[PDB]
Structure 1
């Protein structure tokens, strides 16, 4: 019953869904398997100008997992956005 995530995805635009595919690639640019690891995601935050603890991302990916494989997919990425805007737990 995550309407917030259902509507958030719909409210999106052709540009958003299109750009969502670019970011995923930029994140897994070096990844061989093709998955964004907690370390990979954080590596981008470091060059951005911040320094988010590795305990946050790790716990985040797990909290935003569909099957709990420990990897964020194009789908889990779309929900990760709203999950933060409506983070309660």
Structure 2
């Protein structure tokens, strides 16, 4: 696990991590694929109750990505988005 991320992910409970995994898993054929598309990224975040804007998703992809998102990248993007609630 990349150390920078390791600390973003420390904001999440084991229960949150499991929930987020369950949502993410809807959007991949896990028996052969580890990544969702950038199009699916907003869909999984919205499944989880987040509302990222289109320009935010691109900004996060630019800053977080290591057209695809794996599970740990997705966790970091969820942690970022959870901090913009009002």
TM-score using structure 2 length: 0.53
TM-score using structure 1 length: 0.52
Total equivalences in the alignment: 86
Note if contact 2:23-2:47 (Cα within 8 Å) is conserved in structure 1.
no
Displacement of 1:2 in angstroms is 11
- Provide the aligned C-alpha RMSD in A: 5.3
Unaligned runs of 5+ in 2: none
Does the C-alpha gap of structure 1 residues 8 and 29 become closer, same or farther in structure 2, counting only changes over 3 Å? same
Partner Cα separation in structure 2 for residue 36 and residue 85 of structure 1: 20
1:46: which partner in 2?
A: 46
Note if contact 1:38-1:54 (Cα within 8 Å) is conserved in structure 2.
no
Does the C-alpha gap of structure 1 residues 2 and 35 become closer, same or farther in structure 2, counting only changes over 3 Å? closer
Higher relative contact order (CA 8 A, sep 6+): 2
Displacement of 1:9 in angstroms is 2.0
Please identify the structure whose Cα radius of gyration is greater.
1
Note if contact 2:52-2:81 (Cα within 8 Å) is conserved in structure 1.
no
Unaligned runs of 5+ in 1: none
Partner Cα separation in structure 2 for residue 6 and residue 37 of structure 1: 22
Partner Cα separation in structure 1 for residue 9 and residue 74 of structure 2: 11
Higher strand proportion, which one? 2
Displacement of 1:5 in angstroms is 5.2
